[PDB]
Amino acid sequence: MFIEQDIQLGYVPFPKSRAQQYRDEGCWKSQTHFQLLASLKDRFAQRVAVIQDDKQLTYQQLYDYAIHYGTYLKQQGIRETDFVLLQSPNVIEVFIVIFGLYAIGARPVFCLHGHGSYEIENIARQSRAVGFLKLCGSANESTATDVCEEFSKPNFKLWFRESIVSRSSIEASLPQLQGVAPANLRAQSESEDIAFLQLSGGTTGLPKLIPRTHADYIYSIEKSVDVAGLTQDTKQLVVLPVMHNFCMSSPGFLGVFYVGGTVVLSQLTHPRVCFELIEKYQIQQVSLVPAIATLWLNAESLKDYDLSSLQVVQVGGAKLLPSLAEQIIDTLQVKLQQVYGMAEGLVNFTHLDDSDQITIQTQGKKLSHLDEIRIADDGNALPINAIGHIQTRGPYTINGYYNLPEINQRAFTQDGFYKTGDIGYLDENLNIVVTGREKEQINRSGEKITPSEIEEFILQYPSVKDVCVIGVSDERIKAIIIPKDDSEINLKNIRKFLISKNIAHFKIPDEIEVVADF
Numbered sequence: 001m002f003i004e005q006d007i008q009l010g011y012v013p014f015p016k017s018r019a020q021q022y023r024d025e026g027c028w029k030s031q032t033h034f035q036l037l038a039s040l041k042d043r044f045a046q047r048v049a050v051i052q053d054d055k056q057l058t059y060q061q062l063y064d065y066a067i068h069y070g071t072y073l074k075q076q077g078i079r080e081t082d083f084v085l086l087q088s089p090n091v092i093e094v095f096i097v098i099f100g101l102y103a104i105g106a107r108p109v110f111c112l113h114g115h116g117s118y119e120i121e122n123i124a125r126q127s128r129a130v131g132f133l134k135l136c137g138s139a140n141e142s143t144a145t146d147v148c149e150e151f152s153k154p155n156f157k158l159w160f161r162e163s164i165v166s167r168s169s170i171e172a173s174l175p176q177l178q179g180v181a182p183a184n185l186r187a188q189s190e191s192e193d194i195a196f197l198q199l200s201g202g203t204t205g206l207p208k209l210i211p212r213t214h215a216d217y218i219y220s221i222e223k224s225v226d227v228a229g230l231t232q233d234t235k236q237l238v239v240l241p242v243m244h245n246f247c248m249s250s251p252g253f254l255g256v257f258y259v260g261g262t263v264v265l266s267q268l269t270h271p272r273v274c275f276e277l278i279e280k281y282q283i284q285q286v287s288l289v290p291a292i293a294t295l296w297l298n299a300e301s302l303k304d305y306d307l308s309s310l311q312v313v314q315v316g317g318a319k320l321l322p323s324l325a326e327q328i329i330d331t332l333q334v335k336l337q338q339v340y341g342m343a344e345g346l347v348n349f350t351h352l353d354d355s356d357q358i359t360i361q362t363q364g365k366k367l368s369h370l371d372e373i374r375i376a377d378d379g380n381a382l383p384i385n386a387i388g389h390i391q392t393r394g395p396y397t398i399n400g401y402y403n404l405p406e407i408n409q410r411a412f413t414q415d416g417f418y419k420t421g422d423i424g425y426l427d428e429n430l431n432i433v434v435t436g437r438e439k440e441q442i443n444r445s446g447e448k449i450t451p452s453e454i455e456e457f458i459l460q461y462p463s464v465k466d467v468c469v470i471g472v473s474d475e476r477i478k479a480i481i482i483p484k485d486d487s488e489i490n491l492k493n494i495r496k497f498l499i500s501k502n503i504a505h506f507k508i509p510d511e512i513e514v515v516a517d518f
């Protein structure tokens, strides 16, 4: 079985007990991403799935192009369970390449547009990817081979390097299909096999690989569809990066596909462009982050377009100020829907029948009744209305990043809960309220220190069992160390140990404290 090899390659699977419950309860279903697409072509063949400028794909056309492009990848040497990096802006051909890979059982590795070669190089190595597919909005951008020529080290195993330039027609975007006869392409992947790798939030360093299976990702999409209220008449505007988990599935373009609705792709966030598309296509839903909502609400063009069709606006990132939330609701005359989610798994939505106050003040309810949210104090669970470290496990939450055993020992609890790094509380209605991050960045005399970084090194000290690197005002760096009982755990020795390891001088603790617990 593929899972046997995957485990040896760094995949941490769902424990057998928890996997059975998720089967028994009807969470995990038996469709891969491509079996889902086939059944969507069966139900919604002639419905428009995607629009981008003057290009458009019905569900039938999406499935046909995907078959064709999958046949081409197969002829080029891509094999089932191979990892392939996919970097792309918001162009319509990205849906052909995603499902083309799914059609032969290849495994996408989703990379944000705007990630540099520095990010691509480490992701390619860590995933052992054999391919890099890069889509370009124009003939000016860097091709897949241009990016690979920037690597510091050769990567011989990443031998497939293909670029697609998005042009005025789909047929002209995929000229390599011209000499390929479409194939009955048959992958043997099961729904519980790994479907793809996502990337974690890359604000503090190199992104981590996140393995999702078909069954658990499609389950999350099914649930998101219900809570966002999507139907086959839904028209959704896509302004966020297509490669990002939010835009993909919360409820994302996959949620719209799932119901036979229409996705409208814009390469741009510019207010006037988006307002025009909303008016033109009578868009009813859009997902935003606060920075885009601020841009829209302060545009003086707001009054020049008919935005009457807007019904719901998702806002994700868990960093939405109540004042802006209320401005969103009243200015756009929509139901606000806050989304607190993460590529690693758990997603929380406010509900469409929620009071406006709840949508203003909270990030709503977990997708699954089998989702488990622990607000941890020392590790112990806290009651309602107590602020603590948000931890989670459930039917679509990863049990480990891919091919990262040392990080995994730290990013998950002993009983297998994912540690989000966020703090917050569950209120009286069981709505999550995110109030901040567990360990923010320290401002030590100009330098910005990532606590997680200093913690990793200090954990390489033999007698150390736990450390928490915090900042004090003056800002100084303090390390709270829990010993395994060692007088050699002291400031001078820890500092010299870190210097010897060649960390940045400006990231060494200025103070130590050896306690028995936090």
Ligand SMILES: O=C(O)c1cccc(O)c1O
Pocket: 245, 246, 249, 250, 316, 317, 339, 340, 341, 342, 343, 347
């Ligand atoms: O990564 C995120 O911030 C995010 C936000 C909302 C919904 C999601 O699925 C996410 O991954």
